[PDB]
Design an enzyme around this catalytic site. Structure first.
Site, PDB file in Angstrom:
ATOM      1  N   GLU A  15      38.511 -34.871 -36.013  1.00  0.00           N
ATOM      2  CA  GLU A  15      38.763 -34.094 -37.223  1.00  0.00           C
ATOM      3  C   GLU A  15      37.715 -34.374 -38.296  1.00  0.00           C
ATOM      4  OE1 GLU A  15      42.732 -34.877 -38.438  1.00  0.00           O
ATOM      5  OE2 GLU A  15      43.645 -33.722 -36.810  1.00  0.00           O
TER       6      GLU A  15
ATOM      7  N   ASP B  93      44.089 -27.937 -39.339  1.00  0.00           N
ATOM      8  CA  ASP B  93      43.305 -29.168 -39.374  1.00  0.00           C
ATOM      9  C   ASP B  93      42.449 -29.255 -40.632  1.00  0.00           C
ATOM     10  OD1 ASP B  93      44.319 -30.022 -36.915  1.00  0.00           O
ATOM     11  OD2 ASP B  93      42.744 -28.985 -35.792  1.00  0.00           O
TER      12      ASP B  93
ATOM     13  N   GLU C 161      41.160 -25.185 -37.117  1.00  0.00           N
ATOM     14  CA  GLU C 161      42.002 -25.925 -36.188  1.00  0.00           C
ATOM     15  C   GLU C 161      41.156 -26.384 -35.010  1.00  0.00           C
ATOM     16  OE1 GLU C 161      45.266 -23.453 -35.064  1.00  0.00           O
ATOM     17  OE2 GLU C 161      46.311 -23.653 -36.984  1.00  0.00           O
TER      18      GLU C 161
ATOM     19  N   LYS D   8      45.245 -23.177 -24.926  1.00  0.00           N
ATOM     20  CA  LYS D   8      45.386 -23.562 -26.327  1.00  0.00           C
ATOM     21  C   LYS D   8      44.422 -22.771 -27.208  1.00  0.00           C
ATOM     22  CE  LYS D   8      47.133 -26.337 -29.533  1.00  0.00           C
ATOM     23  NZ  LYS D   8      48.565 -26.278 -29.933  1.00  0.00           N
TER      24      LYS D   8
ATOM     25  N   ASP E 227      37.770   2.089   2.895  1.00  0.00           N
ATOM     26  CA  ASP E 227      37.096   3.161   3.675  1.00  0.00           C
ATOM     27  C   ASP E 227      36.446   2.526   4.905  1.00  0.00           C
ATOM     28  OD1 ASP E 227      36.665   5.162   0.883  1.00  0.00           O
ATOM     29  OD2 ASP E 227      36.603   2.967   0.709  1.00  0.00           O
TER      30      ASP E 227
HETATM   31 MN    MN Z   1      35.580   7.367   2.172  1.00  0.00          MN
END
Ligand code: MN
Length: 1436
Positions: A51, A89, A102, A115, A1049
């Site tokens: 801090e 903070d 913070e 968080k 495909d």
């Molecule tokens: Mn196709």
């Protein structure tokens, strides 16, 4: 025990930095002898220093006493109501702007992002709440991945954490306090964190066993290869015997080319006569739509300087009546320009009717009269122009302003009378030939007009806004009333006589026709030259030309999803037409709903074109016409794909998602994080029902569309795989809503004049009734109550309570170390003891959305990082399993290339190539099927697969989120249907009967399998099933079938035996294909009706192949190149455009379109007043040598074409250098002669070292503008560091932003000050050197730089380094005549960058040539082609 305590207090006593507050924490720290208190004060010391570095690094005042936000504003005298209790903070208040900080530390990425978004959501809650208390909040989150700081060294901190962890080894601490959830949470929180997590309890509550029992119900998975063959042959024989009077024959037919045309022409017979001549078509076309009628007709500086000057001066600062003064100046300029705007288009593109102008001028003059005579007005004018002239003295002056001093010289002696006396004196159908460009030019002008009309600032009769576009000696005016980005009503008019056409469209859809004038005509010319036959010359080519031109112009003039889907169904139809056997249910998916009478005209045009192209006598050639029709479809690919309507598309995608669920009968209502009895029971019941799938042995076997896999076929597949033979204000607004509903009920005299009232009452009801139906969460996965909290951010809680109770009343009438230790040391919620349903933290929370695609709205599933990692684990495990196999083809380019080679080789021998697309691959699949096919395998080298099994079971019970817009629209529809059209679809009835109970928000079912979440599992399963089915067919008829699958495909290649069988017996072949359909439908592999089989084309991954050559596929890539111009630095924009053009020229698109697209892009950049420097976009009029050449090669080519003779001497000296760049003369002498500091003296010494000196007095005379010479261009240090850091809206809005930023404050200088481009142009103006451009590039100008303007850069140095890179990169012929290793090497060379950014033969030179310039495509290229014979012979 106290010995190491004395050692660690000695360690803090030695290696702590001198801080007073850390001596207070040291004072409460050293007096502790308890190990839990030593851990609390030690981690409080470490997070306290975090801090310290956070508050001191971000400049915020540290919150030591845990003061809340209401305490912060309460101490500053800002009264706030009872809001959410959030303890920041650090904080910083500056006026009415609060800044909150913070900070937290996390070791795992999931808790870090978790968080991160939790604190992000809390600070957005404080942002909207304090925004409702009128405080602009600036949130800051300082999340740190490590425990480091600016207070303790690294090994001392590691000794501290290993000392505390060396104190955690004792048993009396954990036995005394801090139980195993917090003990394992703490010890694993201080770790350095993975396959096969095992720190769990695995409490399966009698549920997993039941599912395992339902998986081993009747599946043998142990048979040999003697019963499988007999079983398959017996079942095929029974099926064939049933095919005589029973089954529906697989719905396979035999193409009759004439019958297909007779069915397509008569298709969609709402109102269409099947007799349309080309002349009547053109007659109807040139008078069809109002926009279409605006073109195809028979039509026939001081003002602009003042307008631009007034705009630019009004924009920044001048005052705040102002618009009145500017319009008055405009009137004076017009009346002095007596001997072409008439309505006086004022700044911000707005006009006035000259009437109220005089009234407010009289009012202003009367107010100035009472301030105790025409000279005072002139004095105000001089005041304003003086402020203008000083603001332009700052950096502008008479920069191409063309004598704005007129109002300074003439009106000094001057008058409302003069103005009004100067103002007072001041069909649609034609025949424009379809051979010139005038139509396309008018279309481009109108499109540019709309796109620029999107740029209205919208500040604060006919008071609408207007835009201007000119033509062949006339000047039209577009008029629009509503600003913004939505569709509006536009009106094209003139000033001569009327001509006021009107229409209603959307502006952001007309982009692909802004400057495309010579591109489309060349595309058409190429398409028509493709059809230079020997039979269609008999008066058919001109009709085809007119038809193609009309199609292009109708597509570009009217963007609509309907025509797009129509021409897509058209490419499907032509693929079916050319094939041999098509599906019976094909034309059902080709008919669509068309409205507005324009799509019908497009269909008539397409029908006439198909009739002119595919008439009798076509047997000459077939490839060219097929390619032409494919190009007409991928010409429909021209339409912009930008979701023309959001809410309707979301409703449609949700409907497509939910319909197959309710058709099955397993739709669930919102559960809550648990597993009740009834839902598990119906889960097991529907899992058993999923396996019933009665085969053809019964009397109703072939249902052919029901989801579910038969037990017998699954057992056969598993047995053949295990055997080695398969693969081997609230109150007032609420009462307003109630009284307006009363009005809607009874008071109907005033029909509708409450649009804004409708919007606000709708929003109020949607936020209010959903406030009582919060669809409870208790997961906090970053999105559960957002909009309900935005609407609730400005409302009190008890207010919401009383509002909800009163509205339901009026609606019934018509009918402890937990908190103080969390934020500092240990992490957030971690996975704990999980059941067989969820991870004990959630239940695999997913959310649904739509995806923008040119074909249809694809589904998209998005989730948290935890779920993403679980799915990634399953994904790469199954990917390893499939890489152990070979048949799959998803991402490995080797096997895909092998598939291309095999397909080419098979088509070259004129064999049969089956194509296959599977309809509804998403919903019809199931995770339970994956569990059942996995549980019955062997997979010899086991244990640990139980973790995979329970992970795959976690997907069995997954949740999807219904978007709030959908449920709000459904509630509005229910209210409208209850208060006051009876077309109740299944989804509406579902929502209604759910509303009778509780409104639904979350859905859980079985057969969902969100697309992309389990991609490799689907690939694996499809590979297995395709291989097994092909093996079965080869066993039945004694053939050989190869397959290649991409999970959606697939293509299948038949040997010579099946081709001979088709040539001999069509009945047996039809029976075999119907049996293949039956087998593929028994397992959940439904065949889509678009699947066609034949021996002419092969459809795979949108790449079509025919006998002989391959389809060039021009218009798809052309229309792709016309798009994708985003808002970036134009160097990267040109990079992207050049990459797309390089792909196009890697294809078959003739070169002449490359040059045209590049000229279009350069014109788009010219229009935005961005200097056409040479290093921006590649050269034009290119040779066909786009092979074996990089972008640097083309830049070198344009520079050589731009420099007549010096480049020859540079090439000679560079060849002599490269001959010496070998051994014995290594680069050390050259790298030491780099000299990138002062000037070009390095090249001066290099050329004078081994021969010819450079031609001075002319070399330094050539230099280009590098605007990013000090910093990159901002918009609201080499590139190597950017690459290292990367190692760890609409499309028209992008162009609008590009044009906006390049006019405002864009570039900065060496003084940390921003400026404009016109700033530099006014800074040079001359001074020994003028632009001296050559073919549209304003480049190449300087005389002798040697201290005021350093933005220039010499051409010779850049050409030298680029030529060196191009030579060392590829070949030495370029001098002719017309990952981590690089990081280690940069660390070796750059000495100061080692402590700043750390986190062979010629590499040193190439990495050295990148620190100075940034755009010469070095780092991007460090970490097949079809050319025409004539263009290759044109090469040099
Ligand atoms: Mn196709």
């Amino acid at each position: 025990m106290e010995e190491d305590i004395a050692c660690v207090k000695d360690l803090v006593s030695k290696y702590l930095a001198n801080n007073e507050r850390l001596s207070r924490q040291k004072l409460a720290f050293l007096v502790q002898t308890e190990p839990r208190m030593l851990l609390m004060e030690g981690l409080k010391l470490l997070s306290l220093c975090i801090e310290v570095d956070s508050c001191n690094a971000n400049g915020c005042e540290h919150n030591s006493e845990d003061k809340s936000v209401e305490r912060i504003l309460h101490d500053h005298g800002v009264l706030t109501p009872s809001l959410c209790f959030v303890v920041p903070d650090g904080y910083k208040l500056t006026g009415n702007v609060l800044i909150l900080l913070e900070c937290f530390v996390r070791s795992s990425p999931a808790n870090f992002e978790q968080k991160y978004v939790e604190d992000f959501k809390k600070l957005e809650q404080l942002k909207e709440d304090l925004k409702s208390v009128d405080i602009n909040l600036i949130p800051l989150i300082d999340g740190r991945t490590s425990f480091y700081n600016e207070q303790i060294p690294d090994w001392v901190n590691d000794k501290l954490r290993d000392t505390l962890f060396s104190l955690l080894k004792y048993a009396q601490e954990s036995n005394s306090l801090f139980e195993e959830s917090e003990y394992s949470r703490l010890c694993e929180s201080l770790s350095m964190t993975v396959e096969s997590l095992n720190a769990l309890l695995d409490n399966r509550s009698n549920h997993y066993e039941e599912v395992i029992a339902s998986c081993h119900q009747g599946i043998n998975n142990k048979l040999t290869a003697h019963e499988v063959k007999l079983q398959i042959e017996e079942e095929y024989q029974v099926f064939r015997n049933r095919l005589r009077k029973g089954e529906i024959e697989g719905q396979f037919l035999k193409v009759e080319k004439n019958q297909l045309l007779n069915e397509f022409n008569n298709l969609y017979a709402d109102k269409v006569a099947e007799k349309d001549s080309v002349e009547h078509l053109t007659h109807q076309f040139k008078r069809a739509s109002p926009i279409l009628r605006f073109l195809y007709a028979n039509i026939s500086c001081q003002m602009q300087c003042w307008r631009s000057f007034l705009n630019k001066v009004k924009s920044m600062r001048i005052l705040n009546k102002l618009l009145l003064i500017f319009d008055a100046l405009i009137l004076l300029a017009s009346k002095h320009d007596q001997v072409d705007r008439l309505v006086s288009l004022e700044s911000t593109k707005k006009d006035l009717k000259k009437w109220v102008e005089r009234r407010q001028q009289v009012e202003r003059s009367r107010t100035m009269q009472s301030f105790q005579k025409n000279q005072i007005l002139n004095s105000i004018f001089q005041k304003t122009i003086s402020k203008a002239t000083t603001a332009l003295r700052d950096v502008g002056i008479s920069v191409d302003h063309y004598k704005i001093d007129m109002e300074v010289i003439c009106p000094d002696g001057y008058i409302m009378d003069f103005d009004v006396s100067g103002v007072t004196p001041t069909y649609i159908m034609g025949d424009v030939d379809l051979l010139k460009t005038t139509d396309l030019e008018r279309l481009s002008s109108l499109s540019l007009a709309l796109v620029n009309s999107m740029k209205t600032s919208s500040t604060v009769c006919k008071e609408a806004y207007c835009q201007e576009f000119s033509l062949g000696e006339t000047e039209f005016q577009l008029i629009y009333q509503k600003t913004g980005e939505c569709s509006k009503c536009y009106a094209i008019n003139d000033n001569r006589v009327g001509e006021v056409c009107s229409f209603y469209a959307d502006p952001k859809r007309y982009f692909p026709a802004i400057f495309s004038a010579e591109v489309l005509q060349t595309t058409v010319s190429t398409m028509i030259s493709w059809i230079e036959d020997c039979n269609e010359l008999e008066e058919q080519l001109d009709k085809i030309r007119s038809l193609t031109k009309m199609i292009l112009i109708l597509i570009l003039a009217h963007p609509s999803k309907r025509s797009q889907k129509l021409l897509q169904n058209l490419r499907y139809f032509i693929m079916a037409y050319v094939s041999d056997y098509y599906h019976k249910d094909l034309i059902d998916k080709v008919r669509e709903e068309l409205i507005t009478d324009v799509e019908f005209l497009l269909y008539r045009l397409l029908r006439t074109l198909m009739g002119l192209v595919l008439s009798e006598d076509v047997k000459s050639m077939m490839t060219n016409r097929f390619k032409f029709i494919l190009n007409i479809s991928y010409m429909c690919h021209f339409i912009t794909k930008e979701t023309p309507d959001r809410l309707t598309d979301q409703i449609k995608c949700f409907e497509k998602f939910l319909e197959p669920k309710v058709k099955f009968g397993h739709v669930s209502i919102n559960p809550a994080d648990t597993a009740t009895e009834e839902e598990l029971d119906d889960m097991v019941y529907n899992a058993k029902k999923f396996l019933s799938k009665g085969g053809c042995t019964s009397a109703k076997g072939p249902s052919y569309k029901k989801p579910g896999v038969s037990k017998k076929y699954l057992s056969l597949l598993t047995s053949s795989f295990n055997n080695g033979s398969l693969f081997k204000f609230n109150k007032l607004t609420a009462l307003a809503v109630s009284q307006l509903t009363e009005v809607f009920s009874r008071k109907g005299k005033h029909l509708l004049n409450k649009q804004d009232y409708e919007y606000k009452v709708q929003q109020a009801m949607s936020n209010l009734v959903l406030g009582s139906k919060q669809h409870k969460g208790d997961a906090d996965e970053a999105d559960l109550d957002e909009i309900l909290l935005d609407g609730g951010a400005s409302t009190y809680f008890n207010q919401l309570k009383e509002t909800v109770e009163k509205i339901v009343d009026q609606y019934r009438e018509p009918v402890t170390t937990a908190m103080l230790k969390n934020l500092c040391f240990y992490s957030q919620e971690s996975p704990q003891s999980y059941n067989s349903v969820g991870p004990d933290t959630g239940r695999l929370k997913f959310s649904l959305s739509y995806k923008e695609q040119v074909g249809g709205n694809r589904e998209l599933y998005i989730g948290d990082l935890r779920t993403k990692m679980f799915t990634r684990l399953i994904e790469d495990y199954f990917e390893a399993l499939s890489s152990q196999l070979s048949g799959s083809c998803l991402n490995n380019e080797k096997e895909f290339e092998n598939a291309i080679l095999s397909m080419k080789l098979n088509v070259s021998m004129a064999h049969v190539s089956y194509s296959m697309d599977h309809s509804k691959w998403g919903p019809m699949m199931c995770p339970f099927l994956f569990l059942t096919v996995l549980q019955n395998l062997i997979f010899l080298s086991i244990k640990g697969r139980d973790y995979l099994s329970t992970l795959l079971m976690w997907h069995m019970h997954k949740m999807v989120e219904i978007p709030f817009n959908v449920v709000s629209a459904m509630m509005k529809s229910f209210i409208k249907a209850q208060l006051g059209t009876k077309q109740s679809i299944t989804e509406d009835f579902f929502y209604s009967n759910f509303q009778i109970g509780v409104v639904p928000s979350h859905i859980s079912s079985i057969l969902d399998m969100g697309q992309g979440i389990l991609h490799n599992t689907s690939d694996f399963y499809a590979l297995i099933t395709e291989r097994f089915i092909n093996y079965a067919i080869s066993c039945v008829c004694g053939g050989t079938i190869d397959a290649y699958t991409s999970s959606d495909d697939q293509i299948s290649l038949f040997d010579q035996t099946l081709t001979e069988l088709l040539h001999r017996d069509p009945e047996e072949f039809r029976a075999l294909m119907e049996f293949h359909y039956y087998m593929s439908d028994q397992l959940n592999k439904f065949v889509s009706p678009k699947s066609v089989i034949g021996r002419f084309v092969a459809e795979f991954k949108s790449r079509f192949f025919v006998w002989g050559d391959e389809v060039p596929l021009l218009t798809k890539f052309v229309a792709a190149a016309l798009h994708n111009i985003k808002c970036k630095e134009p160097h990267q924009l040109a990079e992207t455009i050049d990459t797309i053009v390089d792909q196009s020229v890697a294809n078959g698109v003739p070169v002449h379109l490359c040059n045209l697209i590049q000229i279009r892009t350069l014109s788009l950049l010219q229009y935005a007043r961005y200097p056409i420097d040479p290093f921006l976009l590649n050269c034009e009029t290119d040779v066909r040598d786009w092979v074996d050449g990089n972008r640097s090669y083309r830049i070198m080519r344009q520079i050589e074409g731009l420099i007549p003779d010096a480049c020859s001497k540079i090439r000679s000296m560079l060849r002599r250098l490269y001959n010496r760049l070998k051994t014995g003369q290594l680069h050390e002498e050259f790298t030491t002669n780099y000299l990138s500091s002062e000037h070009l003296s390095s090249l001066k010494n290099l050329c004078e070292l081994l021969g010819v000196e450079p031609p001075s007095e002319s070399d330094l005379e050539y230099s280009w503008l590098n605007l990013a010479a000090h910093h990159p261009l901002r918009m609201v240090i080499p590139t190597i560091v950017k690459t290292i850091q990367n190692k760890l809206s609409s499309i028209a809005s992008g162009f609008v932003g590009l044009c906006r930023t390049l006019g405002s404050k864009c570039v900065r200088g060496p003084n940390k000050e921003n400026l404009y481009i016109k700033s530099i142009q006014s800074l040079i103006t001359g001074t020994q050197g003028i632009e001296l451009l050559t073919n549209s590039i304003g480049v190449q100008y300087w005389r002798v730089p040697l201290s005021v303007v350093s933005y220039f850069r010499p051409l010779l140095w850049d050409y030298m380094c680029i030529s060196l890179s191009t030579a060392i990169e590829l070949g030495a012929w370029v001098l002719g005549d017309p990952g981590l290793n690089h990081i280690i090497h940069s660390l070796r060379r750059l000495y100061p960058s080692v402590f700043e950014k750390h986190i062979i033969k010629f590499l040193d030179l190439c990495v050295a040539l990148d620190v100075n310039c940034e755009a010469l495509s070095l780092v991007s290229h460090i970490v097949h082609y079809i050319v025409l014979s004539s263009e290759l012979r044109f090469s040099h």
